[PDB]
Amino acid sequence: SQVQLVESGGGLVQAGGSLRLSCTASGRTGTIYSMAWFRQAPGKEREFLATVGWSSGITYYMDSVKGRFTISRDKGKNTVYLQMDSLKPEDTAVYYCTATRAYSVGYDYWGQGTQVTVSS
Amino acid sequence: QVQLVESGGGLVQAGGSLRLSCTASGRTGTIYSMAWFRQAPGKEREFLATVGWSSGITYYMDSVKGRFTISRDKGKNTVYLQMDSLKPEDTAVYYCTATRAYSVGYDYWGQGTQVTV
Ligand SMILES: Cn1c(=O)c2c(ncn2C)n(C)c1=O
Numbered sequence A: 001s002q003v004q005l006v007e008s009g010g011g012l013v014q015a016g017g018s019l020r021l022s023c024t025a026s027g028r029t030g031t032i033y034s035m036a037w038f039r040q041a042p043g044k045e046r047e048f049l050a051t052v053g054w055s056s057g058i059t060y061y062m063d064s065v066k067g068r069f070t071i072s073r074d075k076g077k078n079t080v081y082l083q084m085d086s087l088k089p090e091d092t093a094v095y096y097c098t099a100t101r102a103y104s105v106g107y108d109y110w111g112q113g114t115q116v117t118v119s120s
Numbered sequence B: 001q002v003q004l005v006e007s008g009g010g011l012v013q014a015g016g017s018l019r020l021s022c023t024a025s026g027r028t029g030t031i032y033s034m035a036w037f038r039q040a041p042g043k044e045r046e047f048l049a050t051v052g053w054s055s056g057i058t059y060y061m062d063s064v065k066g067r068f069t070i071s072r073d074k075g076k077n078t079v080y081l082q083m084d085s086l087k088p089e090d091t092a093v094y095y096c097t098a099t100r101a102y103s104v105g106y107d108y109w110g111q112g113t114q115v116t117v
Helices: none
Strands: A003-008 A011-014 A019-027 A032-040 A047-053 A059-061 A069-074 A079-084 A093-101 A114-119 B002-007 B018-026 B031-039 B045-052 B058-060 B068-073 B078-083 B092-100 B113-116
Touching: A003 A093, A019 A032, A019 A093, A019 A114, A032 A069, A032 A079, A047 A069, A047 A079, A047 B045, A059 A069, A079 A093, B002 B092, B018 B031, B018 B092, B018 B113, B031 B068, B031 B078, B045 B068, B045 B078, B058 B068, B078 B092
Parallel strands: A011 A114
Antiparallel strands: A003 A019, A019 A079, A032 A047, A032 A093, A047 A059, A069 A079, A093 A114, B002 B018, B018 B078, B031 B045, B031 B092, B045 B058, B068 B078, B092 B113
16 A cells, blocks of 8 residues: 555543544655544444645534534644543444545555543 | 525435435635535534545545435536435434634535434
């Protein structure tokens, strides 16, 4: 793979708590147009959550996470973040980061995910 | 600056097929890609598939890959979602979107069309 992604930052918290996910990209990172976070709860489909423009830092959020989660990136460190506040049990899932290449569409590169568990 | 109107859908028998379409009007030259989402009752909007407006390159989520086909006719300003091998859990309101060049996410949304399997 010309770009490799590794997510970290997951773990177990109680409801009301916070986590900060991160994902480092390596390889041909100059080809990245945007990065996005998804999550997959057990037995469910992958759900798109939020995206950030790699060059611009412009962001877009789905209503499921808007106003609790913040996506950002430190371009010089080739790292994207997902700040997750006011976590609820229903946020429990494997969280994946992805990259979309310039002149492509969709989600070209995927990490292996990081587990997020929110208990009562 | 861009308006989207979806057509197609309605009641369809399981195992069958439906083709949805969406026509864009306005500043269509600014469109980089278009994408279909769906929302089952009481659930979140789920991203399904996208097509590059200039190139026709496509991407599908695993939920629909190998069953739905997305395509576009640039001259007619129209994008299509061919839905084959439909299953009960495909019942949802289907929404088409457009993303402007140099934007991110989903800038323009249609009003949706119901598909009931
Ligand atoms: C919206 N958009 C663009 O506008 C774009 C792009 N790659 C190049 N451009 C211009 N990608 C991947 C993209 O999603």
